[PDB]
Swiss-Prot record, chain A:
Major subcellular location class: cytoplasm
GO MF annotations in UniProt: structural constituent of ribosome
GO-annotated cellular components: cytosolic ribosome; cytosolic small ribosomal subunit; nucleolus; rough endoplasmic reticulum; small-subunit processome; synapse
Subunit structure: Component of the 40S small ribosomal subunit. Part of the small subunit (SSU) processome, composed of more than 70 proteins and the RNA chaperone small nucleolar RNA (snoRNA) U3.
A biological process term (GO) from this entry: ribosomal small subunit assembly
Record's protein name: Small ribosomal subunit protein eS28
SUPFAM superfamilies reported for this sequence: Nucleic acid-binding proteins
Gene that this polypeptide is encoded by: RPS28
Swiss-Prot record, chain B:
Basic and acidic residues bias locations: 86-96
Phosphoserine found at: S53
Gene Ontology cellular component terms for the protein in this record: cytosolic ribosome; cytosolic small ribosomal subunit; rough endoplasmic reticulum
Protein name (database record): Small ribosomal subunit protein eS26
PROSITE patterns attached to this UniProt entry: RIBOSOMAL_S26E
Sample GO molecular function, one term: structural constituent of ribosome
From Swiss-Prot, chain C:
Keyword Ubl conjugation: yes
Protein name, per record: Small ribosomal subunit protein eS1
Principal location listed in the UniProt entry: cytoplasm
Subcellular location(s) of the protein: Cytoplasm; Nucleus; Nucleus, Nucleolus
Cross-link (Glycyl lysine isopeptide (Lys-Gly) (interchain with G-Cter in SUMO2)): K14
Family: Belongs to the eukaryotic ribosomal protein eS1 family.
Gene expressing this chain: RPS3A
Cellular component aspect of the GO annotation: cytosolic small ribosomal subunit; nucleolus
Role of this protein: Component of the small ribosomal subunit. The ribosome is a large ribonucleoprotein complex responsible for the synthesis of proteins in the cell. Part of the small subunit (SSU) processome, first precursor of the small eukaryotic ribosomal subunit. During the assembly of the SSU processome in the nucleolus, many ribosome biogenesis factors, an RNA chaperone and ribosomal proteins associate with the nascent pre-rRNA and work in concert to generate RNA folding, modifications, rearrangements and cleavage as well as targeted degradation of pre-ribosomal RNA by the RNA exosome.
Swiss-Prot record, chain F:
Name of the protein in its database record: Small ribosomal subunit protein uS11
The encoding gene: RPS14
GO cellular component, one term: nucleolus
Positions carrying Phosphoserine: S1, S124
Compartments where found: Cytoplasm; Nucleus, Nucleolus
Record organism: Oryctolagus cuniculus (Rabbit)
GO biological process: translation
Source species, domain of life: Eukaryota
Subunit annotation: Component of the small ribosomal subunit. Part of the small subunit (SSU) processome, composed of more than 70 proteins and the RNA chaperone small nucleolar RNA (snoRNA) U3.
InterPro entries in UniProt: Ribosomal_uS11, Ribosomal_uS11_CS, Ribosomal_uS11_sf
Cross-link (Glycyl lysine isopeptide (Lys-Gly) (interchain with G-Cter in SUMO2)): K46, K48, K91
Keyword Glycosyltransferase: no
Compositional bias of kind Basic residues: 127-136
Lineage, opening ranks: Eukaryota, Metazoa, Chordata, Craniata, Vertebrata
Keywords attached to this entry: Cytoplasm, Isopeptide bond, Nucleus, Phosphoprotein, Ribonucleoprotein, Ribosomal protein, Ubl conjugation
Role noted for this protein: Component of the small ribosomal subunit. The ribosome is a large ribonucleoprotein complex responsible for the synthesis of proteins in the cell. Part of the small subunit (SSU) processome, first precursor of the small eukaryotic ribosomal subunit. During the assembly of the SSU processome in the nucleolus, many ribosome biogenesis factors, an RNA chaperone and ribosomal proteins associate with the nascent pre-rRNA and work in concert to generate RNA folding, modifications, rearrangements and cleavage as well as targeted degradation of pre-ribosomal RNA by the RNA exosome.
Length: 62, 101, 213, 356, 112, 136
RNA sequence: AAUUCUUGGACCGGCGCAAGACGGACCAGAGCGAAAGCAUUUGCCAAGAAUGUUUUCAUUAAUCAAGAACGAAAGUCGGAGGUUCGAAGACGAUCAGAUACCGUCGUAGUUCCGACCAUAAACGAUGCCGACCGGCGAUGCGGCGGCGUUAUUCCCAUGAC
């Protein structure tokens, strides 16, 4: 599947077992309106880019 | 000592209400004593929906739901954490917990 | 050490003329090896097809049962057996704070077929209603149920099976009952929940081949 | 875009989900039949221009020819020689990345015999550059306001036509292909070259492809100018703040706000076969001053890398194009109109008399 | 809701007519014209309105053909007005033929 | 081994009965009739341990073998008839229901129409276990 | 996990047939009943509280030793029945032991008809009758007054708010 860019728009909350994954609201650079929720490792900032291997799957919001 | 006013049950002016089998055990609890719960669930959980949204023959077939009404005895309800113990003041609060999202 | 699907003929299934999409699908049978015959073993198979698939595209919650009452040649000819609403629909309708009214009539068509029709209807809450409940008193319930039976009998009794299926393809019976019971207590989610088949007349072929065009 | 008259017959309707699902493989290489015009050398020294060391954006008087398929003399010659689908880069860029379309746009199809002249309406707003089209809210301002969609698009078009020439060493010996520009010191730096695409399903495609300038390292440039007007209301981040820690963020944010404009510009360069597409970061003096501009920075992207980055699919672009050329090489002669539904996401196709 | 895919209204309308219930067949078509499905004129909106105004004539309900066209003129504004022209010409055309038949009926069979 | 349907567009439908108890999973394809069986791969045929007959894993293996086995006979698409145990017992499907339905969609089949067919009684016979339930 | 069931085709899918239980969801701090208790449809039989009344009799009333009717479940005797469940039993596990909790079968019983039995945390742990003493918003049955909405299009008049 083509690799697609999701842009962090608003960092929401921290998740995982040991508080290790930042759960972030992403706004797609490809489609104008589609905004999904993704679990992300490492430190992430409000207003930067992610390279998603799939642009359809969504993580369970808490 | 008297703990509840309505003796842990929603019977007031009957005398007898027919019993029900608990859905975890097969314990006989009266119909109104039991902790009832109505689970409306999608057949396919969370991610399976996307795979069956693409591998479907049809055009926007709103895949069906699963309606299951569950009666728990008080022990099964507390053990499964469907209910919990409460403060002497908070016990009287009958307004069910908010389900905003 | 015998491949059991080597001796299997596929047969195309045909629905009667009352539906848009004719052919339902395919059916497996064993080749006529010994005394027991493919077509005779194939005769009396019940196919439960959703009306969405049976028409082009519509309601998917109403299902029709169809019996392969005869085979002409590489073609199973099905005929109306029964009808049933889907679990999802029936479970979704039945909700708390209202009265559920159920009727059943044992009525016969002009030709041999004697059906058992089950009707269901739920008391509707008014547009400006502040009262939570919206229950019907027992006499209001059995006046509604008496009227349910009176329409359900009249609609079938006087015409033949080709036309009763033409009425069940929409829900003309349920819409007629719903409008009729507006004075007693306004119902809303009124359908003919289920149609059963108790008796058929002794099989004819000329009567089948009028239903198959 | 246009008021639709009661004499105009809707024949075909296509919505964006159906157009998004389209594909075509097997699209062959573009063959440079003709290369025309003269292109200047680019000063790579306008890239020592950052948030601290900016430049004045000056008015440059160079004449831009907005000549369509109808008025193209080479296409008029080539028409009888070979080709049955004639287009410009701006027109096919619109149809190709039609999926992102927000505002009302239109294309006049003219099927004279067994031909498709994908023509544009001269003296209609087709050669404007739209602004914050695909934001959370497009500018909801009135025609008399300065932050209006019309006035922002007006100045955005001006600064692009300014920037393309200003950055350029536009009085040092030009790179000449074969011919002078077929439209006429006074002129602007632009080169029009025509290309044949053999298109699988039995269509030959002759499109006019525009290079903006040449750079050494030789190299061909498609050059455009990104506008930032009043970020805080515009629903974007500020440019002047630092832009250096947040360059990738300032880019990706202005991309979503201008989803269709950046998609048309990038597929414009892929069409022409430009190996590099550059940009120009232009903002105002004060946030409500329409007259003044200052050039903050520029960044360069290879359009093949950029198109897979931002988002595009060549299969989609060529898959939508084969569909529309097939539709209008199927149905009858005369003037048509591919108009997109002003308020909803669906393109419509009307059949019209010989006049409008 | 009532419908997904607004062409299904025609199939319910057609299904009800084979039984001979043009009042609920009209109710079906009425429910679609006034709903979410206001997408600026789908190609299927003409056959819906053609059948709708045929049933409005056959039952003689002018005040419904009012509301029907009043919804239609809105959902086929400057997008395409040929649709209004074709529909309302075909409406008055259908009503004129019902009166032609109604006179000739009363004036040759019943007059004699 | 030859369903004579058209190679291009024609989908041949089966119907897959996914009986998912809380200590076994069945995946069972038949005719639209429901009379003639094509495949039946249980959760227990695949894995050899009693404690994981009702596994999402075992149900995933079972649906994969069913998908592969029915692709050869020329069943392209499937209708679905999911069920728990029912009667007096549980009416929530087993934990293998989801993984099986997912598995024969990951394995390149097409999904027609789905519905619960649990034996829901009007009112039933007395349930197993005493008046005081299953105490543990 | 094992006891148990099965290539003498179990479990699973399909079409039929028979039996004996039970009346899901709707079902509520709703209704009725002296209490125990009482729920699929329809018919027949007798009873009943409450409201309504400018009818009738005119103290006929309240509570009750003796005496009497009904009284869940289990239990007993005789007849019919035995689908599910299941005291004792028989084994399989668990454990130091387990005569238990967990499992597989399973007899009396569980169901109906006719005779006994007369006890329950039979509870509101709260005798029955009568009077007076704050407020508030619902709820079920009956009656009364009242803007308006709605179904009978034909609306008087009936239902639903
Ligand atoms: Mg009691
Ligand atoms: Zn329990």
């Amino acid at each position: 599947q083509p690799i697609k860019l999701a842009r962090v728009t608003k960092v929401l909350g921290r998740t995982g077992s040991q508080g290790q994954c930042t759960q972030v609201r992403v706004e797609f650079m490809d489609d104008t309106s589609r905004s999904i929720i993704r679990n992300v490792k490492g430190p992430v900032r409000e207003g930067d880019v992610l390279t998603l291997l799939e642009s359809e799957r969504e993580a369970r919001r808490l | 000592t008297k703990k509840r006013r309505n003796n842990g049950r929603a019977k007031k002016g009957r005398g007898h209400v027919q019993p029900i089998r608990c859905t975890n055990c097969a314990r006989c609890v009266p119909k109104d004593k039991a902790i009832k719960k109505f689970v409306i669930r999608n057949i396919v959980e969370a991610a399976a929906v996307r795979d069956i949204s693409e591998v479907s023959v049809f055009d926007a077939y709103v895949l069906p739901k699963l309606y299951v009404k569950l009666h728990y005895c008080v022990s099964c309800a507390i053990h499964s954490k469907v209910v919990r113990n409460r403060s002497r003041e908070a016990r009287k609060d009958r307004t069910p917990p908010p389900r905003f999202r | 050490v015998v491949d059991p699907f080597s001796k299997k003929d596929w047969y195309d299934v045909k629905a009667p003329a009352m539906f848009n999409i004719r052919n339902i699908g395919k059916t497996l049978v064993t080749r006529t090896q010994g005394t027991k015959i493919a077509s005779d073993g194939l005769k009396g198979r019940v196919f439960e097809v959703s009306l969405a698939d049976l028409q082009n595209d519509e309601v998917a919650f109403r299902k029709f049962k169809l019996i392969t009452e005869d085979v002409q040649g590489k073609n199973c000819l099905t005929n109306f057996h029964g009808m049933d609403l889907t679990r999802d629909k029936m479970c979704s309708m039945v909700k708390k704070w209202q009265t559920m009214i159920e009727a059943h009539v044992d009525v016969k068509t002009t030709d041999g077929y004697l059906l058992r029709l089950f009707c269901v209807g739920f008391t509707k809450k008014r547009n400006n209603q502040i009262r939570k409940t919206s229950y019907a008193q027992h006499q209001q319930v059995r006046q509604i149920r008496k009227k349910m039976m009176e329409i359900m009998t009249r609609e079938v009794q006087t015409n033949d099976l080709k036309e009763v299926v033409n009425k069940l393809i929409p829900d003309s019976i349920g819409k007629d009952i719903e409008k009729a019971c507006q004075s007693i207590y306004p119902l809303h989610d009124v359908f003919v929940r289920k149609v059963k088949m108790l008796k058929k007349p002794k099989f004819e072929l000329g009567k089948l081949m009028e239903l198959h065009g | 875009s246009v008021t639709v008259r009661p004499d105009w017959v809707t024949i075909e309707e296509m919505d964006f989900p159906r157009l998004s699902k389209l594909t075509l493989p097997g699209v062959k290489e573009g063959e440079d039949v003709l290369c025309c015009g003269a292109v200047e050398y680019y000063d790579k020294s306008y890239d020592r221009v950052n948030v601290k060391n900016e430049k004045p954006l000056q008015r440059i008087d160079r004449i831009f020819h907005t000549v369509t398929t109808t008025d193209d003399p080479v296409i008029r010659k080539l028409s009888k020689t070979e080709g049955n689908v004639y287009a410009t880069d701006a027109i096919l860029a619109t149809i190709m990345c039609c999926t992102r379309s927000n505002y009302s746009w239109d294309i006049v199809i003219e099927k004279i015999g067994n031909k498709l002249f994908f023509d544009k309406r001269d003296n209609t707003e087709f050669d404007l550059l739209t602004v914050n089209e695909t934001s959370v809210e497009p500018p909801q301002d009135d025609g008399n306001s300065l932050n209006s969609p019309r006035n922002l698009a007006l100045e955005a078009t001006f600064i692009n036509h300014n920037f393309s020439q200003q950055v350029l060493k536009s009085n040092e010996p030009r790179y000449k292909f074969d011919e002078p520009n077929p439209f006429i010191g006074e002129v602007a730096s632009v080169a029009y070259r025509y290309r044949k695409w053999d298109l699988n399903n039995g269509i030959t495609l002759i499109a006019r492809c525009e290079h903006d300038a040449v750079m050494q390292g030789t190299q061909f440039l498609t050059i455009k100018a990104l506008n930032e007007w009043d970020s805080k209301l515009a629903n974007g981040v500020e440019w002047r703040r630092k832009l250096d820690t947040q360059r990738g963020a300032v880019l990706a944010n202005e991309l979503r706000n201008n989803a269709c404009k950046l998609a048309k510009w990038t597929v414009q360069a892929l069409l022409a076969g430009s190996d590099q597409l550059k940009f120009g970061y232009v903002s105002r003096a004060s946030v409500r001053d329409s007259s003044k501009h200052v050039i903050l920075e520029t960044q360069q992207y290879k359009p093949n890398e950029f198109a897979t980055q931002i988002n595009l699919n060549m299969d989609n672009a060529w898959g939508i194009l084969r569909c529309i050329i097939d539709i209008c090489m199927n149905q009858k002669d005369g003037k048509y109109l591919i108009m997109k539904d002003p308020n909803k996401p669906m393109i419509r196709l009307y059949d019209i008399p010989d006049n409008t | 809701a009532y419908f997904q895919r607004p062409e299904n209204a025609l199939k319910r309308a057609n299904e009800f007519l084979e039984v001979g219930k043009k009042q609920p067949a009209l109710d079906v078509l009425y429910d679609v014209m006034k709903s979410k499905k206001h997408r600026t004129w789908q190609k299927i909106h003409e056959p819906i309105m053609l059948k709708y105004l045929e049933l409005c004539v056959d039952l003689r309900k002018s005040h419904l053909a009012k509301e029907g066209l009043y919804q239609y003129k809105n959902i086929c504004q400057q997008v395409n007005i040929k649709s209004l022209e074709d529909v309302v010409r075909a409406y008055l055309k259908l009503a004129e033929e019902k009166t032609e038949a109604a006179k000739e009926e009363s004036q040759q069979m019943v007059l004699d | 081994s030859l369903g004579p349907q058209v190679a291009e567009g024609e989908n041949v439908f089966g119907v897959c009965h996914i009986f998912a108890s809380f200590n076994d999973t069945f995946v069972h394809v038949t005719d639209l009739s429901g009379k003639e069986t094509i495949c039946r791969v249980t959760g227990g045929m695949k894995v050899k341990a009693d404690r994981d007959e009702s596994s999402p894993y075992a149900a995933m293996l079972a649906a994969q073998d069913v998908a592969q086995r029915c692709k050869e006979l020329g069943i392209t698409a499937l209708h679905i008839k999911l069920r728990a145990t029912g009667g007096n017992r549980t009416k929530t499907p087993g934990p293998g229901a989801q993984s099986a339905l997912r598995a024969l969609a990951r394995s390149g089949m097409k999904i027609g129409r789905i519905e619960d067919v649990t034996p829901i009684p009007s009112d039933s016979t007395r349930r197993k276990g005493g008046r005081r339930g299953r105490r543990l």
